[PDB]
Write a protein that binds this DNA or RNA. Structure first.
Lengths: 292, 231, 93, 164, 292, 310, 93
DNA sequence: AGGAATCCATTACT
DNA sequence: AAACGGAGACCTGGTCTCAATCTGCGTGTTC
DNA sequence: AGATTGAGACCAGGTCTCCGTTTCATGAGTCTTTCCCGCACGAGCGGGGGTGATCCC
DNA sequence: GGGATCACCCCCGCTCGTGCGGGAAAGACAGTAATGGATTCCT
């Protein structure tokens, strides 16, 4: 049960006879269509109709994403046309017995040192609010960046202190990757467990498990070395791209989702961040030809 | 293949109906000219290209000058020209016509020569019957539009019913039929709702313009004449 | 009243002023107007012959589900239907 | 450089209230002769065109054919190059709108018109005529109002004009 | 009793104090408006609102015409706000017996020799058609003009024998000045006597008093000398323009119409044109002064 | 509001789903975003599509679209549907245009309850055939009876138009057929699919959560597409096939006759209203100035952007 | 549904291609479409904050007997109010 | 007697 | 005198090609 | 690789005065009757939206 | 009572119908012109 989350950039993609061929900048790749389960289409990538017809038959998930999935724009069908995860998700969100169960499960994942499952969620936001405030302060101490209180404005991105702009900019980079995987695997973005009422309610909830681990420290780190005038909005995006280059965060969350949904171990389908050129020796056993 | 009639002028068919066109325009201190087959009103700041087709009567006030070819160009549209001055209107102008059927005129002739016919129209006239610069602006706007529609359909301004004995006798009979109805309440409102430093000429004509379009008085011009003429 | 608009360019100056009797001129060789459907062809028929050399096109209120329909004659912006839908075609040189 | 000279005539002007009467065309390229013409049957002819050219129901039934097949053949042989003719933009507008009724497809051609380029060399008055333009370029032959005669007439007009 | 039909060409008009100021390049004119009854304006002339005002209050007549009346464009108020003529003109058309008498006088004005009292409208229409057919025929060969037929094309007049446009141009030429005079005099063209049901019904019943005398002799005259490749219409128009400059024809319409409308000789108002550069000698006693 | 940047706009600027056109077809052409304009690179020239007035932008065989081109279309909510031979091959869509999600939450809570599922399944079939009483039977024979009505309807229409029917029922999942009746009906139906595909994304409805049909990621479309396929596209499709002549691109002719049915049928006003009836959404003028909120079983929904530690 | 007309002189090319997603281009720098009162005004907010140093004007149906009201910002052809009737003012030399 | 000029009869055209 | 029309006059806003730089437009524990 | 910004060169076309040239583009010896075409008008109506009752909690 | 369910208008956009005021198109209205047959003259 392996899912291939192949990412492609600067490429024109079509088919020759029965396999997807990729005409990128520095060569041509001929990966078989069977392997492609989930495709990550980066910026400046072109798609041919015949390839779509070939990939439409295999149930491949097509998602238009930013550079290394930094930002999500549009999505196609789910992976292998499956919908089991979406159905289980719907059942869990509808009943409070399961609504609490997952809510504690995420909240516990944000408190590895404390088990607060038995305490009512009213103070959980208070307990969580202290944790992020603690995380904000200690991160500020490490990088010596002044921090008083996170203030922002959706209508006023440029104004305010850079750190809030940098922190806000890095967060949006995080939503893109996690929103890509949920659409490819078949999660409904609207059905949010903790957040509710917005089409991204799940996205802010699922990314909440990675607020305190990746996006916040990177934003503090890049803002510390950044000076006045530099467009931290793109600077934060580029470094968050670097943290996504390895794809370890891709594997981490793809296992957490069905873990959050109480999917049995047999149903734990794993996504492997296969790359056309970062896994040269890994694709050639399957019988793929490369052109330069 | 082309099958094209001669162009460069306009047949009354291409002109919109007397109802579709607007009520009136007011011009001051301008030199009217006809450039590139277009009527233009030239002010010191700049020039304006009036859409003569979509306007009924084009008033002209003190200190304005009009070229000959402009009058010719306006006559093609058939829009009436009225020279508005201080203390009431001064002199009138008109094209030739807009409708080629003289039925209303012929009926107008029948109703004017027969004395008993005049009494019928005069009695029919009565049924739908029931600060100086401000009231004057309302009158001339009323006079101009009613003259244009009368001249559009070929009706004779000379042949009046009550106001008689002058070349524009019919206009003075049809215009005052609506004077006490629309303009008077509007004129009273201008005097009550007035302020110093405001362009009375601009403001008074602006409100009278709204009253005419809101009240569908232009709609009533054709119908009231048609029913009064049994056409 | 339904709205119709006519554009002009590279046409004799007489036409560029003639339409001003009917249609206001926002900018160089563009016009707007509110005429009955009967008046539309009469203005266009004049434009069909008084045009001379140049380029012109017209838009107007239409019963197509977009709301407008396109008329172009000897224009680099050819109008081509897309299943009963007006679109502008710009052939490459 | 390939062009098609198309000449057609309707029973009026309105899109929904009028119908195509005759269709004939010739491609004017490389000087090879493939002269084609067609006719449409009908039962009602307006008096004005009747007096101008002469069209009757008997003629349409004895010679004219079905609208759909004639239009299909037209779309078949006009799919390669542009459509050119005298005052041809107005005719093409109506003809393409007619393809909408019968669903011929998407006509893709440049709407360029021969008459507009002819008017340029004078730009004197606001009205021009066919026999005015033809005599200006040494085309003494008058209008036969038929498909092939007008086709060769416009062919000679294109040879003489050559603004393209 | 006295009416002045002044015709100004190629000049502007204003006032200084109480008289119009012709702005021709040749000089400066200050004709008082007290003696002015009708004011004809030719092409290329200007008139100001401030100049017009005195024209209205003195009861003059402002009439826009072509070159000395070849075509009519627009008019204004008639003489001295007097409707004594249209009112009498009104009561004649409505009464058939009056219409019989007026129509009969129209024919006897064209042909005093023939008896007309027994005739009716159809008789007058038929007899006139017989007469003009004879007049067309006899005069055609007098000028060595091959006249195939009189065909007038209201849409495309260009195609045809040179006489047709020439005759049409000659015909429409007279229609102009007669319309301007009758509008200045104060009779609407709607009230026809023989012709009816048209805007110019009265014109087509009045112009016939001079069609056989002015139009046809000059129409064939230009047609006889007409050359190939020329606007016969323009040449005919030029010749008709020269004929109109003499005011002797103009003196007829003012006289004939007054007689035609049964106006008593005491009430008849004779008129004559007053040229600006040709009647200086006689206008000097009237108060007209000239400056160069 | 915020600054306006070339290529992006909010939902307030965009017109509602009911004030938009049907669809476009493209064949043998390339799609690109040049000068911040969605464009089609056909054989002869280019054309700029006003995507805001586009419900869905269909893609035939031999078409290409770049990544940046999809982004522009995704901002305005236009679905992307690839319809080649054998019916549609793949689907694509962007963000939900509407900011509220109350339509989506009702769909999830309704689908779990079989009693709610059964009543909606009876409500959905009532609109298909109001003349019948179906408030008793259960799912297993809805497919039989809805299917029987569909099969019988197809047979009668085919006989009337005189077009022979192979008896193969339209299956969007791997459609098969090459005879002129096939692509006549297949192209007609996928036109209905495109408008439905966008509106479920436009209103924020999960495409894979359907009642009658389950087991694939586009189930909900199939359930609601059937609400009009037997009433709109099938009558039109067979009409085209009957009048179809030899050597003519019937796909074009068929595609045109759809829109005439679409506009006259008042589908957008009807179809959007029908989704309300199926979801039984109460009528109320919700301002929803606060779209997102935090779930609170004890106390309704608490807002966001607040540190609850103090 | 009131008609909308858009003209553009010396405007950045980004807006010229971006606004095609709402209107069709009958002529270069000239755009037209059929929106409501709300949508059209928001499209003004787009052009007003991206034209910069440029020229743009619009017309839309209104409750005037001429049938439309003029809208203009930073354009050579200004608009002058003649007793409520919107007419094109063109400055001269 | 026959044609031909004339006249009348007549349709026909302006 | 006005106005058109042409032949000049030179105007410039748009189209196009060319590197160069970029992958993108950013609230959800802000009060 | 697909896309945007900019600098660069381009230039057709809008605009200008000057110059020449027109004073305009062309029917109605007869109206009357019966036609045709129209978009005009009202008014019929659907159709829901809003409003108003019952129906269900 | 409130929400939920089943029905109340209004009325206004929408559709359609006649229909009216315009076409155009013929068909009337008189004496001559022109053609041909009867009459008369001529071979």
């Amino acid at each position: 049960d392996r899912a291939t989350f192949i990412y492609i950039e600067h490429a024109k993609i079509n088919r020759v006879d029965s396999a997807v061929t990729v005409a990128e900048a520095k060569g041509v790749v001929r990966i078989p269509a069977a392997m492609i389960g989930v495709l990550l289409l980066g910026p400046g990538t072109d798609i041919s109709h015949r390839a779509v017809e070939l990939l439409g038959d295999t149930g491949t998930a097509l998602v238009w994403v930013g550079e290394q999935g930094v930002r999500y724009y549009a999505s196609g069908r789910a992976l292998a046309r499956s919908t089991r995860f979406l159905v289980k998700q719907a059942e869990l969100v509808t009943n409070e017995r399961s609504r609490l169960r997952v809510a504690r499960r995420m909240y516990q994942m944000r408190f590895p040192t404390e088990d607060v499952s038995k305490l009512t969620m009213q103070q959980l936001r208070s307990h969580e609010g202290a944790r992020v405030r603690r995380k904000y302060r200690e991160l500020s101490k490490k990088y010596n960046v002044p921090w008083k209180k996170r203030v922002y404005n959706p209508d006023d991105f440029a104004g305010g202190d850079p750190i809030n702009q940098a922190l806000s900019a890095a967060h949006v980079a995080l939503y893109g990757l996690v929103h890509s995987v949920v659409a490819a695997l078949g999660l409904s973005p609207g059905l949010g467990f903790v957040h509710t009422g917005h089409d991204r309610s799940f996205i802010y909830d699922v990314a909440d498990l990675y607020k305190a681990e990746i996006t916040v420290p990177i934003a503090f780190a890049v803002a510390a070395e950044a000076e006045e005038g530099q467009d931290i909005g793109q600077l934060a995006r580029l470094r968050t791209r670097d943290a996504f280059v390895d794809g370890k965060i891709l594997k981490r969350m793809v296992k957490d989702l069905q873990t959050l949904l109480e999917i049995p171990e047999e149903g734990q389908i794993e996504a492997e961040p296969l790359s056309l050129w970062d896994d040269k020796e890994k694709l050639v056993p399957y019988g793929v030809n490369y052109s330069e | 293949m082309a099958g094209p009639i001669i162009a460069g002028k306009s047949e009354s068919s291409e002109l919109p109906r007397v109802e579709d066109r607007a009520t009136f325009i007011y011009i001051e201190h301008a030199k009217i000219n006809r450039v590139d087959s277009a009527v233009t009103v030239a002010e010191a700041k700049g020039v304006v290209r009036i859409p003569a087709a979509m306007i009924g009567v084009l008033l002209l006030g003190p200190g304005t000058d009009i070229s000959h070819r402009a009058v010719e160009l306006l006559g093609d549209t058939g829009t009436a020209l009225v020279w508005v001055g201080e203390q009431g209107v001064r002199y009138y102008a008109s094209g030739r016509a807009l409708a080629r059927s003289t039925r209303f005129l012929v009926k107008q002739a029948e109703l004017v020569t027969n004395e008993r016919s005049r009494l019928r129209v005069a009695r029919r006239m009565y049924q739908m019957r029931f600060i100086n610069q401000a009231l004057s602006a309302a009158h001339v706007a009323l006079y101009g539009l009613v003259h244009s529609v009368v001249a559009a359909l070929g009706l004779s301004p000379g042949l009046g019913f009550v106001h008689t004995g002058h070349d524009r006798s019919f206009i003075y009979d049809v215009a005052d039929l609506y004077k006490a109805e629309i303009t008077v309440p509007i004129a009273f409102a201008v005097a009550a709702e007035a302020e110093e430093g405001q362009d009375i000429g601009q403001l008074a004509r602006l409100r009278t313009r709204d009253a005419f379009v809101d009240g569908k008085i232009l709609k009533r011009m054709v119908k009231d004449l048609q029913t009064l003429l049994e056409i | 009243m339904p709205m119709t608009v006519i554009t002009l360019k590279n046409v004799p100056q007489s036409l560029r002023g003639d339409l001003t009797r009917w249609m206001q001129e926002i900018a160089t060789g563009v016009y707007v107007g509110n005429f009955n459907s009967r008046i539309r062809e009469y203005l266009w028929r004049r434009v069909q012959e008084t045009m001379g050399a140049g380029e012109a096109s017209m838009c107007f209120a239409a019963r197509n589900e977009l709301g407008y329909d396109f008329l172009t004659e000897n224009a680099s912006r050819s109008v081509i239907d897309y299943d009963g839908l007006p679109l502008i075609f710009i052939p490459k040189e | 450089i390939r062009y098609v000279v198309i000449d057609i005539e309707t029973d009026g002007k309105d899109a929904k209230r009028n119908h195509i009467l005759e269709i004939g065309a010739i491609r004017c390229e490389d000087g090879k002769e493939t002269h084609f013409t067609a006719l449409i049957s009908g039962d009602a002819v307006p008096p004005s065109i009747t007096k101008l050219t002469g069209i009757t129901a008997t003629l349409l039934q004895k010679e004219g054919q079905e609208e759909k097949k004639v239009l299909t053949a037209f779309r078949e042989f006009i799919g390669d190059d542009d459509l050119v003719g005298y005052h041809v933009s107005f005719d093409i507008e109506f003809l393409r709108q007619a393809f909408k009724k019968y669903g011929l497809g998407y006509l893709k051609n440049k709407t360029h018109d021969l008459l507009r380029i002819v008017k340029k060399e004078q730009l004197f008055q606001a009205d021009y005529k066919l026999e005015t333009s033809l005599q200006s370029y040494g085309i003494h032959k008058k209008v036969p109002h038929r498909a092939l005669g007008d086709a060769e007439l416009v062919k000679c007009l294109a040879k003489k004009l050559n603004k393209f």
